């Protein structure tokens, strides 16, 4: 259909779902594929090939459920997979206060141009990784501007 409409709906869906999870300290890990493919990491998860919504993203990460333990990977206009493996960064610069989801988000950002969003189950803070860099505990305004810049062409 109309790509700009799809891209803005994707941004809204990430914003609403991460707001919901952040308030409840639900851990989450959502990686959005870009020019470089993520197909090999999609293959490690449970296939969904589903329409993007804030509601599905939230339902996926509910603790102690079949789909929660790993990354969601979004490819084109679909939630491709849940519970996917991402490579862990070995960087010693990542703070030891951060958990596996952050190290996974950092790891995938070091080998793809994907944009990955994390919700910390410890703090509720929202972080983002891109190109081997971490943007830690961003405000709602900051998250919106980054997602606009990176996900809207
Ligand atoms: N908990 C985790 N979530 C996603 N990718 C991972 N790779 C290793 N541990 C992981
Ligand atoms: Cl069209
Ligand atoms: Cl966490």
Cα dihedral 12/16/17/21 (nearest 10): 150
The answer to whether the annotation marks 100 as part of a ligand binding site is yes
Resolution (A): 1.5
The closest ligand to the CA of 97 turns out to be 3
Q: What is the DSSP string of 50-99?
A: EE--HHHHHHHT-TTSTT-SSEEEEETTEEEEEEE--PPP--TTS-TTS-
The answer to whether the annotation marks 122 as part of a ligand binding site is yes
Domain count, the chain: 1
SS3 state at 1: coil
Quick one: which atom of ligand 1 is closest to the CA of 100?
Answer: 1
SS3 state at 142: helix
CB of 57 within 8 A of CB of 22?
no
Q: β-strands 133-135, 71-75: how paired?
A: unpaired
Task: State the structure-solving technique.
Answer: X-ray
Look at residues 60, 145, 72, 132 and name the one whose alpha carbon lies nearest to residue 103. 132
Chain breaks in the chain (C to N over 2.5 A) after: none
Q: Which residue has the tokens 């020019």?
A: 35
Query: Containing domain of residue 18, as a range?
Result: 1-153
Q: Angle between the 3-23 and 140-151 helix axes, to the nearest 10 degrees?
A: 150
Give the number of other Cβ atoms within 10 Å of residue 1's Cβ.
5
């Amino acid at each position: 259909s109309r790509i700009e409409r799809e891209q803005h709906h994707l941004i809204e869906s990430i914003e609403k779902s991460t707001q919901y999870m952040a308030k409840r300290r639900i851990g989450a890990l959502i990686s959005v594929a870009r020019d470089t493919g993520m197909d090999d990491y999609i293959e490690t998860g449970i296939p969904l090939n589903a329409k993007i919504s804030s509601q599905l993203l939230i339902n996926i990460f509910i603790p102690n459920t079949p789909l929660h333990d790993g990354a969601v990977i979004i490819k084109g206009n679909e939630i491709a997979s849940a519970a996917s493996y991402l490579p862990l960064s070995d960087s010693p610069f990542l703070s030891k206060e951060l958990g596996t989801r952050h190290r996974a988000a950092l790891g995938i950002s070091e080998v793809t141009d994907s944009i990955t969003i994390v919700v910390s189950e410890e703090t509720g803070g929202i972080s983002l990784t891109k190109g081997g860099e971490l943007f830690r505990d961003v405000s709602e305004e900051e998250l919106h501007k980054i997602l606009l810049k990176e996900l809207v062409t």
